[PDB]
Amino acid sequence: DPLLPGYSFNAHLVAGLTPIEANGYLDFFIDRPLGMKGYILNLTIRGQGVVKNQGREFVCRPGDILLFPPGEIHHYGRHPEAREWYHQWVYFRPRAYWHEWLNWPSIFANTGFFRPDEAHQPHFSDLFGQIINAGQGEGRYSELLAINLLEQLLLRRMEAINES
Amino acid sequence: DPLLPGYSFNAHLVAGLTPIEANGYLDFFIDRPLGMKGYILNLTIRGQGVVKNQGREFVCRPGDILLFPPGEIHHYGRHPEAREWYHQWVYFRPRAYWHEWLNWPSIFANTGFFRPDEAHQPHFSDLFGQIINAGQGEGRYSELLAINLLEQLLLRRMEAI
Ligand SMILES: O[C@@H]1[C@@H](O)[C@@H](O)CO[C@H]1O
Numbered sequence: 001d002p003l004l005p006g007y008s009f010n011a012h013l014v015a016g017l018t019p020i021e022a023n024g025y026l027d028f029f030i031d032r033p034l035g036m037k038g039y040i041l042n043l044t045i046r047g048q049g050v051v052k053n054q055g056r057e058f059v060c061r062p063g064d065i066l067l068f069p070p071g072e073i074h075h076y077g078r079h080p081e082a083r084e085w086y087h088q089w090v091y092f093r094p095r096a097y098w099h100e101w102l103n104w105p106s107i108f109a110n111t112g113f114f115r116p117d118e119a120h121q122p123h124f125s126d127l128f129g130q131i132i133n134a135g136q137g138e139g140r141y142s143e144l145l146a147i148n149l150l151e152q153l154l155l156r157r158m159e160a161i162n163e164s
Numbered sequence: 165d166p167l168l169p170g171y172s173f174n175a176h177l178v179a180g181l182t183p184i185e186a187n188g189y190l191d192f193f194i195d196r197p198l199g200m201k202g203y204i205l206n207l208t209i210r211g212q213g214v215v216k217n218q219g220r221e222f223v224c225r226p227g228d229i230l231l232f233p234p235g236e237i238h239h240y241g242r243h244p245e246a247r248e249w250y251h252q253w254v255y256f257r258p259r260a261y262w263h264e265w266l267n268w269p270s271i272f273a274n275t276g277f278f279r280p281d282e283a284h285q286p287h288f289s290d291l292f293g294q295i296i297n298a299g300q301g302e303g304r305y306s307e308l309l310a311i312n313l314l315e316q317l318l319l320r321r322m323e324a325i
Pocket residue numbers: 002003004005018030040074087089091
């Protein structure tokens with residue numbers, strides 16, 4: 001189960017939805033102090049989460065997208081004053097030419113943040129969901145599609161931030 | 165105007181819609197007898213076209229997707245029995261790893277053909293429209309986005325067959 005400790009993330013893209021509910025089986029903090037081998041993109045869809053990094057804390061809310069590069073600390077979970085923290089996520093290894101699009105302004109350390117304009121929220125949420133659906137497919141082209149959709153999301157962000 | 169002959173198609177992706185109407189300004193056959201350097205994907209969205217190749221003819225209708233690889237003859241226009249032939253198209257240079265997804269069954273010579281089933285039709289039409297939108301947009305990422313959406317279409321076809 002990728003939603004619980006013990007799972008091995010390495011070369012393959014893995015995607016899912018973590019529906020944390022207070023006092024439930026997922027009500028614990030993701031705690032990977034040494035970081036991961038690949039990247040993780042995280043979209044909050046309901047509730048609130050608290051992201052911690054060496055004494056600092058950041059409250060993420062529905063519509064916020066976070067970026068965790070390889071080696072970066074992962075220490076986040078349901079915000080103590082929130083009933084839940086539902087977040088979609090995708091673990092991945094980038095294609096070579098994606099690096100310009102992985103340069104996001106940090107909330108702290110090297111943990112990136114992106115929040116689409118309210119008007120664009122629906123598209124990004126829908127796109128993120130398409131990534132999960134593809135990521136969890138078993139077809140010969142499932143992973144390739146998930147990777148492609150992720151690339152689309154990174155490009156849509158590039159257009160979004162440069163819209164003016 | 166890429167819609168008119170003499171346009172220089174080279175390394176940049178170019179996309180558009182050619183709304184051919186009988187007797188209108190676009191009512192002529194595209195004719196590139198020695199082909200092009202890049203690929204062209206073509207989706208018919210209205211009316212009917214006639215694709216020709218050294219005497220042979222193929223009538224394409226709404227929902228038909230054709231693939232013209234580099235060097236392939238381009239000779240096509242409004243079908244004589246149709247009042248129009250609106251087709252969306254995208255000229256491109258592929259990413260290296262796309263080649264395994266570009267070997268489509270051919271109507272003749274090496275002109276590929278793909279007709280999504282009725283269930284997949286709306287999604288592919290929707291996707292092609294997004295390609296044209298991205299390809300015609302302004303900014304430093306319009307072309308990359310179009311390339312991205314194109315790769316998606318290629319992958320959805322592989323998945324659909
Ligand atoms: O819930 C977590 C998710 O936030 C991401 O870190 C991947 O692993 C899952 O277990």
